[PDB]
Design a protein around this nucleic acid. Structure first.
Ligand SMILES: [Mg+2]
Lengths: 222, 222
DNA sequence: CGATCTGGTCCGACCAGATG
DNA sequence: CATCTGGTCGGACCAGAT
């Protein structure tokens, strides 16, 4: 696909300093011809990339190429994963860590402000296929569920940005049985902790599951 | 601006259930004419909104309208702020909260993994204009700085998605002198803690500044 | 040889900021 | 005001989906 091709081409070039961050993108009129698509297409592509933080469009001035690390949002996680294959592993570990540490914040909060709701999400733990694809979504829906269940939606949005790569990684991890089991427990355990009002035992819990689930996923990759 | 007008109009409609989430967007051909712009423009806008997660475009099928809460990332913060004026206040408190609670995670980490770097960011604390606009950026650069300084870039990206509204809020808060002072302290204090390897006192600290800096912003608004 | 609704891409002309 | 750059027109033509 033209647009598809176009976007990859630009992103590609920006990635491996062909269109270095800090520089200027070739005028739309030449860039399009140079790419092999019509302005119209390029145009739509520049508008999309612009929204992901890759570029800075300003009527009448060359379009600036940015350092994503400076203007790109959690939405480029899947991309920064397809560009640097050798990094992926680490990148994942970082993603998972962020989830763990961050979730403790809102999980512990959700159990405090709206336990009634937090229990409703942890409820979805039951009635669920024993298939990877299924879990992945549930699991995600659980963490994203609890995040909103904190009353501070922003965590929810944060979770939204992580969906993309999180799930993919899940679809692979939850293929393993030993993994599906750990989660269920982690879930049931949380729900217990929420009911028993053991709010002060959440961190220790969440912290482990991360570590444990982490170790499994580690063996699955090695 | 056409594109400008168009986007607002669509986002506007999606906001106050004119184009309810879960429904279908009028065909591009009629929607354009209905808005007052040419398909070419509308098209660019649909591609933009599409990336922010507002729509789901699939060649050949109607464009689905989404529940942003489900697919939008931290980048709609500035938007969810312009749409719901009455919520802004709360919306900000939430943002700041997120900042505080999340930051201890990476600030504490950064002090462990790369003190050397974390000290280089806290260094910018000095040599800085005593003007709001200035600080705002410094302050943001400092937290974003420490985020990357933790080795887990993901926090950095998270901070990126927050830049928008965070700064705007800053530009208003840092106009107050009493605010500018509190930060400096928080910065210097952070740098000491880092130097002294007081790795276990950070939470207590960061937590306060938030509370204290929060109280000031509170009085500034009331 | 289905008919039709909907998106994707292409042209080439013109409007309109930014800046020498 | 010249020209570089992006922004908007419209109204032809290709292509997936039911
Ligand atoms: Mg030239």
């Amino acid at each position: 696909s033209p647009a598809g091709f176009a976007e990859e081409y630009i992103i590609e070039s920006i990635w491996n300093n062909r269109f270095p961050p800090g520089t200027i993108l070739p005028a739309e009129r030449e860039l399009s011809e140079l790419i092999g698509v019509t302005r119209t297409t390029l145009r739509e592509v520049l508008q999309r990339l612009a929204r992901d933080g890759w570029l800075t469009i300003q009527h009448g001035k060359p379009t600036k190429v940015n350092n994503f690390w400076e203007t790109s949002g959690l939405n480029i996680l899947e991309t920064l994963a397809r560009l640097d294959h050798e990094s992926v592993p680490q990148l994942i570990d970082n993603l998972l860590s962020v989830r763990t540490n961050i979730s403790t914040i809102f999980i512990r909060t959700a159990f405090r402000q709206h336990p009634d709701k937090a229990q409703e999400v942890l409820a979805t733990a039951n009635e669920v296929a024993d298939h990877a694809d299924a879990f992945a979504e549930l699991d995600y829906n659980i963490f994203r569920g609890l995040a909103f269940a904190s009353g501070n939606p922003i965590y929810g949005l944060i979770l939204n940005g992580m969906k993309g790569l999180y799930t993919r990684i899940g679809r692979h991890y939850f293929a393993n049985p030993e993994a599906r089991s750990l989660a269920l427990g982690f879930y049931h355990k949380l729900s217990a902790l929420c009911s028993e009002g053991a709010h002060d035992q959440v961190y220790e819990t969440v912290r482990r599951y991360g570590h444990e689930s982490g170790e499994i996923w580690h063996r699955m990759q090695k």
